[PDB]
Amino acid sequence: ILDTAGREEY
Amino acid sequence: AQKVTQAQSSVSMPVRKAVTLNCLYETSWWSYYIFWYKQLPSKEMIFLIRQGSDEQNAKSGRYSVNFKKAAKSVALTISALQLEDSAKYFCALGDTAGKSTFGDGTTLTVKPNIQNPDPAVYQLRDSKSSDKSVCLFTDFDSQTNVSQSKDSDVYITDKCVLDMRSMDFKSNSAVAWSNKSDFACANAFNNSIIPEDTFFPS
Amino acid sequence: MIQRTPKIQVYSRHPAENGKSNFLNCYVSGFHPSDIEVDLLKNGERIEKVEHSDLSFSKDWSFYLLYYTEFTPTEKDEYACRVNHVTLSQPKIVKWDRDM
Amino acid sequence: GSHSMRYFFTSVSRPGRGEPRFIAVGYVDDTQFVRFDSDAASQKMEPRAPWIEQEGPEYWDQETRNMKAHSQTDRANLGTLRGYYNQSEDGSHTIQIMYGCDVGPDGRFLRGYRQDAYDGKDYIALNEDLRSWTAADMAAQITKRKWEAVHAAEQRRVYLEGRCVDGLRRYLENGKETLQRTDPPKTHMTHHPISDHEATLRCWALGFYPAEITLTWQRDGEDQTQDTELVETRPAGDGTFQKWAAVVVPSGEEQRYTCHVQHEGLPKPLTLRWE
Amino acid sequence: AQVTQNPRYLITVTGKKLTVTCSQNMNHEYMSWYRQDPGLGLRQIYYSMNVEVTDKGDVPEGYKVSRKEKRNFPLILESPSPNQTSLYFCASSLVSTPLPKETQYFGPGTRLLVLEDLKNVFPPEVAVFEPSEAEISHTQKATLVCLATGFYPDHVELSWWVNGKEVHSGVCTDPQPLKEQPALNDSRYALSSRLRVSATFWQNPRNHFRCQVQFYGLSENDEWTQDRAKPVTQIVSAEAWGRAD
């Protein structure tokens, strides 16, 4: 199950 | 199915006590969150607490969740009730990608501790007019229920708790009014069971 | 930018036995970037119905892919894998050697 | 007997071919179970192992939505990195991401991983304490400061120690028959004369699972890492793996060499000799 | 740190395109729209996990959204119809799955009413009813009652102002207006509120009491062809002064 997209902008 | 059920539509509990608001859900989601919300009479919506599907029982202030995963039940418990806890509480389910499903809510009424009751019915006249008047049923204790009018041209509100904060004094009241010629405060609350010692001014 | 050349291995899934149904594999690994072209050859001719695995990579970030097809080997039929990549001047042909 | 779950994301800018390509694959141990490809027709996360096909339509829709959100942020991150490195819109570039968790034999958390790469090299990685970041260069240092301000580490650690472990257990249960297997390697040796005074001994291991294996050559007990050639462990394509190790030996000295095979499926290590 | 919705109240006619804006300046990735019919829960319309990511909720039909920048998440109704009459909430949070102590923020709500025409919109009349002398001599307290009547729709806010300042101590307002003609769907409404003070406070003639009702009605640019005054957004008040015994 995937992690939730978020807090990963470079 | 995908459904959140709050089976009690209304609950009433005395100040300083504890209440438990139930929530059952059906879902095929196996990784999720349960949210609890508080909606004020102003309809302002306020997030309270979140319970993760893989977490221990959530706890925050006077709120706690009793999460029973196999039962799919996540009741919310509010401790040491205050009058400001009167609201409609919503239970909700959320997945791992922004989607959510709400239950339809439970209305919580926190009843004040009226320790010097003095039930009475008063007539109040308009600040400006010659005809207009209002009847006020006030100072009854919390166990009195005001019954809705069953007469179309008489208006009666539900009961209402005000708090004179500086005096540490609480009291209930309801208001009734009418355009009728024959309308009188002795008859206004006829369809409610009111205390036997209710003061009607001479 | 770092550029890595594919390493290429051609082999059968099971030990090769003439006349018995098998799978022919071409495993390309250690390459970067990810665009790559891979054919399986039978007697120098491109085999048509060829499948491949979904792109992934190893601990050092280089990619790997398996291309594969069903086949029944003989003593007369030569098999090979033909690979092209930005690190290669021309297609690279590695022959299937069953007795390796 | 520990286990793993891992996701491998690849996002490739294609200047001259429109939108970037977004790919992701998931693994439990050395078994793949899901895939996504923005070039494929479905636009959906798709099953790639039989024990994940039980998952219902809301699981696939939920995974597809998280893939779509991931792809948009990779789309923006390609542009950000182009600016950090003073590159061009005409250049193709690659972002790679790996993350996942290991559980023990009881099924509880043991370690978590999150690591990002740009054009085949480390860019930024979550450290082992899941509270700290290693930036590989000055560009990544900007990203590190951003991620310290927005509680990135905690956001990753909540997944790695939570949802990740809980999904891994579910999959290990649902695919228990295949995922708990341990196939020992079947071994043999070939012999190939190079000259009339030299020969190649090749030690073969076939049909083993999981993929991790050790093959070493000894010469009279001596570790022999002199001219010992070793290939990349490769997939059979039926769920098992293959490897070989070779050494060139002087003709007539064949029996002075031994091959040792270490695999989790072997009670004791195997020793092999050409005889 | 707040979620803003504009407008908070809107009365519009069937089929006239409208947009309700939602914004927050906390750099939140996640934003979501819901509608709440009376007595029910929140039904998700659309939500957005980050810039340029949108996804349908349970009830997307008749609605569109966009997410061009982090700050804004507008709700667009291409052709409003009466069954889109509802209370709309925008919510936001830093990420789509918040951390333990992280909050979901809600906007104040948008009361949207879609009508065939605006002919039934009516501002309230407001009256203040002075305390009875019998309550004063029986309790040494004095309750004022405010009554707002004849208004439609029920888009009102009632406040009490004593000597120029809003008060909440001693106030109780009905949680919901009631219908004056419960048989009609277009019934006008009434609302009541009480303010209780001490007898000595009511008996000081320099004390001033104002009941104020803010009515949210038509805008200036709404068309009006009727004889009576256009029922625009406005404040209606009634007052009383204290009186010596």
Side-chain angles (χ1 to χ4, degrees), chain E residues 58-75:
Chain E
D58 285 316
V59 294
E61 308 72 20
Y63 304 99
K64 295 303 175 70
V65 297
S66 80
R67 193 81 186 287
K68 284 200 246 256
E69 55 267 337
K70 228 176 206 95
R71 153 187 211 274
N72 303 300
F73 191 44
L75 184 61

Side-chain angles (χ1 to χ4, degrees), chain B residues 37 39 98 127 139 157 160 173, chain E residues 30 36 104 128 172 194 196:
Chain B
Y37 305 95
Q39 186 172 41
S127 193
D139 294 339
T157 74
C160 209
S173 76
Chain E
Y30 177 84
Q36 180 188 39
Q104 302 181 21
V128 166
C172 207
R194 323 98 170 102
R196 203 165 196 188

Side-chain angles (χ1 to χ4, degrees), chain C residues 1-2 7 9 11-14 25 27 29-30 32 34 54-57 60-61 63-64 66 99-100, chain D residues 8-10 25 27 32 35 48 92-93 96 115 117 119-120 122 192 202 204 232 234-237 242:
Chain C
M1 226 189 268
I2 64 139
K7 284 81 173 302
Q9 296 186 73
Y11 53 99
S12 60
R13 167 179 304 176
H14 310 287
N25 299 332
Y27 185 66
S29 62
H32 217 293
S34 50
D54 315 298
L55 191 67
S56 188
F57 47 87
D60 72 350
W61 306 106
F63 299 101
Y64 61 85
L66 175 71
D99 288 312
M100 190 179 290
Chain D
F8 298 95
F9 302 82
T10 306
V25 300
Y27 282 79
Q32 194 193 336
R35 72 134 176 244
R48 296 291 273 170
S92 190
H93 299 268
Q96 284 161 269
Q115 284 152 211
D119 285 333
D122 289 359
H192 291 289
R202 184 163 286 109
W204 278 93
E232 275 174 18
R234 53 191 209 201
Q242 310 171 352

Side-chain angles (χ1 to χ4, degrees), chain B residues 63-106:
Chain B
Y63 311 110
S64 45
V65 172
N66 181 6
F67 180 46
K68 299 193 238 169
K69 177 181 234 156
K72 295 195 167 82
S73 157
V74 49
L76 161 68
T77 297
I78 316 170
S79 267
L81 287 169
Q82 307 151 21
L83 289 183
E84 290 68 40
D85 295 328
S86 296
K88 190 168 179 178
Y89 290 77
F90 292 94
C91 181
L93 202 35
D95 74 357
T96 67
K99 201 186 194 355
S100 75
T101 304
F102 268 66
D104 283 328
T106 296

Side-chain angles (χ1 to χ4, degrees), chain B residues 103-143:
Chain B
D104 283 328
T106 296
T107 295
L108 170 67
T109 310
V110 174
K111 277 183 291 138
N113 183 37
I114 302 284
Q115 212 82 92
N116 297 308
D118 197 353
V121 166
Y122 299 113
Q123 174 159 11
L124 290 66
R125 295 203 140 98
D126 190 334
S127 193
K128 80 147 173 76
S129 256
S130 37
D131 178 89
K132 289 157 62 174
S133 311
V134 163
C135 307
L136 177 72
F137 180 32
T138 197
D139 294 339
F140 47 95
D141 88 337
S142 278
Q143 216 205 336

Side-chain angles (χ1 to χ4, degrees), chain B residues 1-149 151-202:
Chain B
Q2 182 72 23
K3 165 136 199 44
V4 185
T5 69
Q6 294 170 258
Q8 328 148 288
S9 35
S10 35
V11 195
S12 192
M13 209 57 38
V15 54
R16 277 164 253 122
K17 304 320 295 328
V19 81
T20 293
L21 311 168
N22 296 324
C23 183
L24 304 176
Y25 57 93
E26 320 156 39
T27 186
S28 62
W29 305 350
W30 54 261
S31 187
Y32 51 84
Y33 290 95
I34 286 109
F35 316 103
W36 276 99
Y37 305 95
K38 188 197 177 192
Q39 186 172 41
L40 302 194
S42 77
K43 307 309 201 212
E44 180 186 343
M45 189 78 42
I46 293 153
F47 163 91
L48 297 182
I49 192 166
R50 167 188 70 96
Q51 170 70 60
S53 73
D54 311 320
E55 299 168 17
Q56 291 310 283
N57 281 343
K59 183 147 191 151
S60 176
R62 298 176 300 123
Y63 311 110
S64 45
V65 172
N66 181 6
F67 180 46
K68 299 193 238 169
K69 177 181 234 156
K72 295 195 167 82
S73 157
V74 49
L76 161 68
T77 297
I78 316 170
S79 267
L81 287 169
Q82 307 151 21
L83 289 183
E84 290 68 40
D85 295 328
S86 296
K88 190 168 179 178
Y89 290 77
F90 292 94
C91 181
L93 202 35
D95 74 357
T96 67
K99 201 186 194 355
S100 75
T101 304
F102 268 66
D104 283 328
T106 296
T107 295
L108 170 67
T109 310
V110 174
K111 277 183 291 138
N113 183 37
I114 302 284
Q115 212 82 92
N116 297 308
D118 197 353
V121 166
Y122 299 113
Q123 174 159 11
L124 290 66
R125 295 203 140 98
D126 190 334
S127 193
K128 80 147 173 76
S129 256
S130 37
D131 178 89
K132 289 157 62 174
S133 311
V134 163
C135 307
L136 177 72
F137 180 32
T138 197
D139 294 339
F140 47 95
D141 88 337
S142 278
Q143 216 205 336
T144 296
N145 296 334
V146 176
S147 97
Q148 192 33 60
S149 173
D151 181 344
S152 289
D153 45 32
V154 173
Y155 305 102
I156 308 185
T157 74
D158 319 323
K159 71 194 215 203
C160 209
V161 194
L162 63 84
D163 173 13
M164 307 179 67
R165 292 163 194 167
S166 61
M167 273 156 104
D168 182 28
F169 175 92
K170 287 126 217 151
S171 62
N172 298 307
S173 76
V175 172
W177 70 94
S178 178
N179 292 318
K180 266 171 140 292
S181 301
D182 54 6
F183 184 64
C185 299
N187 296 332
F189 302 89
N190 263 4
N191 217 1
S192 309
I193 296 136
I194 65 180
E196 300 97 288
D197 42 336
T198 288
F199 178 54
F200 288 82
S202 325

Side-chain angles (χ1 to χ4, degrees), chain E residues 35 60 73 90 96 100 103 108 137 152 189 203 222:
Chain E
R35 61 179 282 179
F73 191 44
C90 185
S96 316
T103 285
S137 61
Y152 176 97
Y189 294 90
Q203 284 162 340
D222 280 312

